[PDB]
Design a protein around this motif. Sequence first.
Motif, PDB file in Angstrom:
ATOM      1  N   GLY A  91       0.611  -0.716  -0.161  1.00 21.60           N
ATOM      2  CA  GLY A  91      -0.346  -0.018   0.166  1.00 21.60           C
ATOM      3  C   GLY A  91       1.149   1.146   0.214  1.00 21.60           C
ATOM      4  N   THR A  92       0.510   1.963   0.653  1.00 18.86           N
ATOM      5  CA  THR A  92       0.626   3.557  -0.102  1.00 18.86           C
ATOM      6  C   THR A  92       1.490   4.320   1.274  1.00 18.86           C
ATOM      7  OG1 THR A  92      -1.641   4.594   0.064  1.00 18.86           O
ATOM      8  CG2 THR A  92      -0.889   4.301  -2.080  1.00 18.86           C
ATOM      9  N   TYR A  93       0.278   3.469   2.317  1.00 20.17           N
ATOM     10  CA  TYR A  93       1.308   3.874   3.709  1.00 20.17           C
ATOM     11  C   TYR A  93       2.149   2.614   3.751  1.00 20.17           C
ATOM     12  CZ  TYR A  93      -3.887   4.625   3.588  1.00 20.17           C
ATOM     13  OH  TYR A  93      -5.323   5.187   3.109  1.00 20.17           O
ATOM     14  N   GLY A  94       2.278   1.269   3.881  1.00 18.65           N
ATOM     15  CA  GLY A  94       3.440   0.174   3.943  1.00 18.65           C
ATOM     16  C   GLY A  94       3.718  -0.862   3.446  1.00 18.65           C
ATOM     17  N   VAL A  95       4.533  -1.198   3.599  1.00 20.30           N
ATOM     18  CA  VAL A  95       4.073  -3.019   2.634  1.00 20.30           C
ATOM     19  C   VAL A  95       2.866  -3.689   3.943  1.00 20.30           C
ATOM     20  CG1 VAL A  95       5.805  -3.933   3.884  1.00 20.30           C
ATOM     21  CG2 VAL A  95       5.260  -5.167   2.002  1.00 20.30           C
ATOM     22  N   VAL A  96       2.306  -4.590   3.285  1.00 19.00           N
ATOM     23  CA  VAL A  96       1.394  -6.124   4.105  1.00 19.00           C
ATOM     24  C   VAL A  96       1.995  -6.720   3.992  1.00 19.00           C
ATOM     25  CG1 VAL A  96      -1.001  -5.977   4.152  1.00 19.00           C
ATOM     26  CG2 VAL A  96      -0.217  -3.886   3.318  1.00 19.00           C
ATOM     27  N   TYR A  97       1.591  -7.784   4.660  1.00 16.88           N
ATOM     28  CA  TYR A  97       2.357  -9.263   5.519  1.00 16.88           C
ATOM     29  C   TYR A  97       1.380  -9.558   5.375  1.00 16.88           C
ATOM     30  CZ  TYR A  97       6.893  -7.742   4.727  1.00 16.88           C
ATOM     31  OH  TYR A  97       8.435  -7.409   3.743  1.00 16.88           O
ATOM     32  N   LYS A  98       1.353 -10.978   5.023  1.00 19.08           N
ATOM     33  CA  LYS A  98       0.046 -11.849   5.867  1.00 19.08           C
ATOM     34  C   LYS A  98       1.027 -12.668   7.037  1.00 19.08           C
ATOM     35  CE  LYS A  98      -2.617 -16.459   4.861  1.00 19.08           C
ATOM     36  NZ  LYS A  98      -3.369 -16.623   3.671  1.00 19.08           N
ATOM     37  N   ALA A  99       0.663 -12.611   8.241  1.00 17.32           N
ATOM     38  CA  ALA A  99       0.938 -13.225   9.806  1.00 17.32           C
ATOM     39  C   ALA A  99       0.245 -14.254  10.191  1.00 17.32           C
ATOM     40  CB  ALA A  99       1.415 -11.533  10.511  1.00 17.32           C
ATOM     41  N   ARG A 100       0.940 -14.849  11.047  1.00 15.74           N
ATOM     42  CA  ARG A 100       0.436 -15.710  11.714  1.00 15.74           C
ATOM     43  C   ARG A 100       0.758 -15.308  13.779  1.00 15.74           C
ATOM     44  NH1 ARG A 100      -1.574 -20.006  12.009  1.00 15.74           N
ATOM     45  NH2 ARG A 100      -1.625 -22.456  13.282  1.00 15.74           N
ATOM     46  N   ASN A 101      -0.322 -14.940  14.193  1.00 15.90           N
ATOM     47  CA  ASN A 101      -0.238 -14.616  15.645  1.00 15.90           C
ATOM     48  C   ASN A 101       0.407 -15.869  16.707  1.00 15.90           C
ATOM     49  OD1 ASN A 101      -0.651 -14.985  18.596  1.00 15.90           O
ATOM     50  ND2 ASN A 101      -2.020 -12.790  18.290  1.00 15.90           N
ATOM     51  N   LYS A 102       1.896 -15.998  16.718  1.00 14.30           N
ATOM     52  CA  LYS A 102       2.648 -17.005  17.416  1.00 14.30           C
ATOM     53  C   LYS A 102       1.336 -17.434  18.770  1.00 14.30           C
ATOM     54  CE  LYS A 102       7.557 -16.001  16.299  1.00 14.30           C
ATOM     55  NZ  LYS A 102       8.520 -15.230  16.815  1.00 14.30           N
ATOM     56  N   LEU A 103       0.461 -16.710  19.724  1.00 20.65           N
ATOM     57  CA  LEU A 103       0.136 -16.936  20.337  1.00 20.65           C
ATOM     58  C   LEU A 103      -1.291 -18.566  19.673  1.00 20.65           C
ATOM     59  CD1 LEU A 103      -1.157 -17.873  23.040  1.00 20.65           C
ATOM     60  CD2 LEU A 103      -1.790 -15.594  23.087  1.00 20.65           C
ATOM     61  N   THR A 104      -2.110 -17.145  19.454  1.00 21.54           N
ATOM     62  CA  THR A 104      -3.438 -17.576  18.759  1.00 21.54           C
ATOM     63  C   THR A 104      -3.689 -18.185  18.090  1.00 21.54           C
ATOM     64  OG1 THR A 104      -3.919 -15.341  18.384  1.00 21.54           O
ATOM     65  CG2 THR A 104      -5.051 -15.791  20.415  1.00 21.54           C
ATOM     66  N   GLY A 105      -2.704 -18.121  17.212  1.00 16.00           N
ATOM     67  CA  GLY A 105      -2.282 -18.384  15.859  1.00 16.00           C
ATOM     68  C   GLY A 105      -3.322 -17.924  14.680  1.00 16.00           C
ATOM     69  N   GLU A 106      -3.975 -17.083  14.879  1.00 18.17           N
ATOM     70  CA  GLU A 106      -5.046 -16.513  14.172  1.00 18.17           C
ATOM     71  C   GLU A 106      -4.481 -15.858  13.003  1.00 18.17           C
ATOM     72  OE1 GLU A 106      -6.825 -12.909  15.663  1.00 18.17           O
ATOM     73  OE2 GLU A 106      -5.850 -13.502  17.992  1.00 18.17           O
ATOM     74  N   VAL A 107      -4.706 -15.653  11.546  1.00 13.11           N
ATOM     75  CA  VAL A 107      -4.476 -15.561  10.798  1.00 13.11           C
ATOM     76  C   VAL A 107      -4.053 -14.036  10.287  1.00 13.11           C
ATOM     77  CG1 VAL A 107      -4.200 -15.244   7.870  1.00 13.11           C
ATOM     78  CG2 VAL A 107      -3.432 -17.523   9.193  1.00 13.11           C
ATOM     79  N   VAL A 108      -4.059 -13.208  10.244  1.00 13.46           N
ATOM     80  CA  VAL A 108      -4.585 -11.429  10.441  1.00 13.46           C
ATOM     81  C   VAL A 108      -3.042 -10.604   9.263  1.00 13.46           C
ATOM     82  CG1 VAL A 108      -4.553 -11.187  12.421  1.00 13.46           C
ATOM     83  CG2 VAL A 108      -2.098 -10.602  11.643  1.00 13.46           C
ATOM     84  N   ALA A 109      -3.059  -9.169   9.091  1.00  7.98           N
ATOM     85  CA  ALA A 109      -2.767  -9.104   7.698  1.00  7.98           C
ATOM     86  C   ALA A 109      -1.955  -8.258   8.695  1.00  7.98           C
ATOM     87  CB  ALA A 109      -3.727  -8.169   6.454  1.00  7.98           C
ATOM     88  N   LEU A 110      -1.100  -7.827   8.460  1.00  6.14           N
ATOM     89  CA  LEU A 110       0.165  -6.904   9.216  1.00  6.14           C
ATOM     90  C   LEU A 110       0.258  -5.989   8.671  1.00  6.14           C
ATOM     91  CD1 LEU A 110       1.484  -7.557  11.913  1.00  6.14           C
ATOM     92  CD2 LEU A 110       3.128  -8.278  10.813  1.00  6.14           C
ATOM     93  N   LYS A 111       0.112  -4.967   8.751  1.00 14.50           N
ATOM     94  CA  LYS A 111       0.469  -3.600   7.823  1.00 14.50           C
ATOM     95  C   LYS A 111       1.626  -2.895   8.761  1.00 14.50           C
ATOM     96  CE  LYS A 111      -2.552   0.466   6.446  1.00 14.50           C
ATOM     97  NZ  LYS A 111      -1.913  -0.178   4.559  1.00 14.50           N
TER      98      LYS A 111
END
Length: 290
Positions: A13-33
């Motif tokens: 994006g214009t604000y910054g790069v976006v990564y697909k991430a895995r919260n090491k605890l809950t294991g939930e998948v998120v979009a890390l900006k």
Amino acid sequence: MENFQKVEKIGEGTYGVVYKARNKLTGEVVALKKIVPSTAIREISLLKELNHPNIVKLLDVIHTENKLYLVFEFLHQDLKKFMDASALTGIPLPLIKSYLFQLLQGLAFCHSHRVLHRDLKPQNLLINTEGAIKLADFGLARAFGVPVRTYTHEVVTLWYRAPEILLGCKYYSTAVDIWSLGCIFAEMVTRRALFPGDSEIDQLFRIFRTLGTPDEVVWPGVTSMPDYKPSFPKWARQDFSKVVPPLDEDGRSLLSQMLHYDPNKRISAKAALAHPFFQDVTKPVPHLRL
Ligand SMILES: Cc1nc(C)c(-c2ccnc(Nc3ccc(C(F)(F)F)cc3)n2)s1
């Protein structure tokens, strides 16, 4: 931040790069900006409470050593990609109508809370296999800014920018989001960008060639606008039938109202929800390839 394990560069994006991430605890998948003035922090933090089924949920905000990480819920695909993947056949009307309806729903919500997106575009609309479509990077424009360029060493897209912004209006309203959604709507129907300008003047002129050069008649006060030049070529308005074929009369009526030059005359998200075009609205499921 050491709570996530990067998985893949999902975007840029214009604000910054976006990564697909895995919260090491809950294991939930998120979009890390990964993207600051306290003003921004209060701003992007107030958004945490702006939740809606059609708004990409802003899970959390991480400000470590002047590094701003934004955690959003994750969706497997954006409209731009789906649109390209539906290039040969196009998106079925029923699906188009459902998406606009939901987007208008997200917009009505944000707008009622006096929040604008300011930069809607196909890459900012995310879809899931449930037939849901959500607005991403909402309110992140005011929270920060939006220049002609950025650090991403990339180019901005003005294809969806409302004329009042291009003409120098500094205090634009929620109506810019409707103009943008109108462009996307037309793009879903024609499978081609409506006004794919490559500069601000080209952008403005492509709008002019299609909707006609605005004047005091259709847009009171337009000539007072900062970047208005009495020298703009006078283009005639081209009939809407030639703009979004083969969209039906109800849709062309909704579109024309979302593309009125006068922001004050431009249809509101809440009012667009009551347009006859959605009289037979449903919620079909898309066929995504993940
Ligand atoms: C820009 C973005 N800002 C946010 C919050 C974004 C987000 C949030 C959740 N999921 C996604 N998914 C996604 C999936 C596929 C693509 C691509 F690049 F393949 F078209 C792009 C984006 N994107 S993208």
